[PDB]
Design a protein around this ligand. Structure first.
Ligand SMILES: [Mg+2]
Ligand SMILES: [Mg+2]
Lengths: 388, 388
């Protein structure tokens, strides 16, 4: 017998005075989800866990009312694979998406995405394999435990000066990060320049810098910053203008030869397809940052990957936003370009299993069953507290 | 003194087994919102009301936990107009949109949109004018109370045959409608053709027919139906493919010369801009169906109208989805092409004030303060029950 007995959720606050060009995290929250099954492995009932990335808020309401419900009410015998010995992720996904009209991909995409995370976590556990291994298997490829990761921070903070900004970055390098990212568009262009120069000097030749405007710029501002930014050897210029202003993104290629990135705020394969159709991005050097946790989960992310395939893009151009382990697993199993990471932020949600550290901007995925949340004690404590 | 003292919500059911090509309304709900102020007019405290259109479900959670709070946690003095004698819709809007990241326009767009409806209702009431008159004023134009409306129905219902379909339509004509819309794509193409021929037969020369595929078709299916549909004198072919597959919509122009429509499922001015940029629609004959109630409200709708201007479209090409009075007001005040109406479904959430009747596909807006909900007793009963 294979059945999801319960779907629990709990809203957790991950707010600080932190700020980017678009928002501040004063009221930021996130949803911690648990998919409780009746399957037993190791004399212990298998439970899937998941949570949504920072930035979009928790989705407790949606998870209870529309999705947790549709699963629990579905005929358990219709959510299994051929063998009937495990849950079929796609069948569960389809189950929670019945009676959902097209378009409007936001908020509910976060609820479904976070539930999906837990479903896959459970499935991998039921199969007794690490999610990333199971993924590679399903795709008929060999996984690669080594995953590139970069440290994201450099937020605007009340009373934070060049001194501290510097400290923060150095702190990341001390952790083994060879690539750091930072917020811009939150200060006048010239004050920003000074903040950028301050980090380039601190990291010297031990790391590369990436800047993120959080989609705050209009065309002219984006170009102004481009002219200023292009004189520095930046790793990438992220989300210049509004996530949906594909024309703006395309126009930028004329002023910024260096790699650009965007996509963290596009939550469906349809929206991803539009970016590849109209964004004018360069497939040989730009990065796609779609986050499965906020975009209907891995079941959907697989469709997005198929979209890349139809447009000639390599999955290695993907570096998911979110800084969570689900992405680490997808990256390792399907060959993504890497993953985002938040060393000192939104903890314990995210991070890496206890022990493994960042050596040369990389980490090595330990062979833990499922996503591997159990390996991170401070995070797992929260999860087993929700459901066990 | 102008303080918004409270923002109350309550979820109302609007479910039934009616079905379209994509969804069935088995669990459909909607949010009824009330914006209670401390301003007194007629010895009675002015309260704004609003509710979201059918199809996207209620948003109690979001309204409660994210938007109502912000509006209540704000300085009353910073939400007023220059004179300080009334609320500034845009300031209230900005107030509830703080710390909201770009993209992901779905769900929260419904929450904000429905609260926005109530806010404008209150503002117009505080100003002692009908919302549509106040709108025209603010734009420096003369409002027009004569608004075109069409009857939307023709759903697939268990056990519903050509006989009943016919009856439904005739029922609409009996009430004065000269334009009815039916659902297609929920059955075989030849079965559907029969349904259309029947309806056409029934309405003869007293009305025109519009078909709606609810964005269910892929390119080939869309074209197949186009070849079949084009032989009939239809009013319009609505939402052929996915709301976000602009390329699909564009490819259709080669096979369907007749007017097409779409937009009910795009919920932001950014998404509307993409439709105008890539959808390949014909501005001289197609229709845009953006619904302010599901798209961050009138404050946002005004930006969408600005997008139309930037792309050479007339506001008269707009016929909002939703069948609610907020749209009727925007239509009358800003010169939209008309509004959708559901004479039988989702009542009492929609319709016109008691007494106003449909004459030759048109209704005339009575000069009621605000949106005019008070004029519809069965609806107002529900509203004053929420807050008074
Ligand atoms: Mg970003
Ligand atoms: Mg439609």
């Amino acid at each position: 017998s294979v059945r999801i007995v319960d779907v629990r959720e709990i809203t957790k606050p991950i707010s600080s005075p932190i700020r980017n060009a678009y928002i501040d995290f004063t009221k930021m929250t996130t949803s911690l989800v648990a998919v409780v099954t009746d399957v037993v492995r190791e004399g212990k009932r298998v439970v899937g866990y998941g949570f949504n990335s920072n930035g979009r808020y928790g989705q407790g309401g949606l998870i209870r009312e529309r999705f947790a419900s549709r699963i629990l009410e579905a005929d358990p015998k219709k959510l299994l694979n051929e063998a009937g010995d495990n849950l079929d992720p796609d069948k569960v996904w389809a189950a929670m998406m019945i009676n959902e009209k097209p378009g409007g991909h936001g908020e509910r995409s976060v609820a479904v995405g976070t539930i999906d995370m837990a479903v896959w976590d459970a499935v991998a556990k039921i199969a007794g394999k690490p999610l990333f291994r199971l993924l590679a298997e399903r795709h008929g490829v060999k996984a690669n435990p080594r995953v590139f990761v970069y440290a994201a921070g450099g937020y605007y903070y009340p009373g934070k000066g060049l001194s501290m900004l510097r400290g923060e970055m150095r702190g990341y390098l001390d952790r083994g990060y060879n690539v750091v990212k930072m917020k811009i568009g939150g200060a006048p262009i010239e004050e920003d320049r000074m903040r950028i120069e301050a980090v380039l000097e601190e990291i010297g030749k031990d790391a590369q810098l990436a800047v993120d405007a959080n989609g705050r710029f209009n065309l002219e501002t984006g170009i102004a910053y481009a002219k200023m930014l292009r004189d520095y050897p930046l790793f990438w210029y992220e989300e210049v203008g509004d996530p949906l202003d594909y024309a703006l993104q395309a126009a930028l290629a004329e002023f910024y030869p260096g790699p650009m990135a965007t996509g963290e705020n596009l939550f469906s394969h349809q929206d991803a397809r539009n970016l590849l159709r109209y964004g004018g991005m360069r497939p040989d050097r730009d990065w796609l940052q779609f986050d499965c946790a906020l975009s209907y989960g891995l079941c959907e992310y697989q469709r997005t990957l198929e979209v890349l395939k139809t447009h000639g893009w390599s999955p290695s151009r993907c570096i998911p936003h979110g800084g969570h382990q689900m992405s680490l697993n997808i990256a390792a199993g399907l060959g993504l370009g890497g993953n985002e990471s938040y060393p000192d932020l939104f903890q314990p949600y995210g991070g890496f299993p206890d022990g493994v550290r960042v050596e040369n901007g990389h980490i090595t995925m330990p062979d833990l069953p499922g996503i591997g949340f159990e390996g991170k004690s401070d995070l797992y404590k929260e999860m087993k507290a929700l459901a066990e």
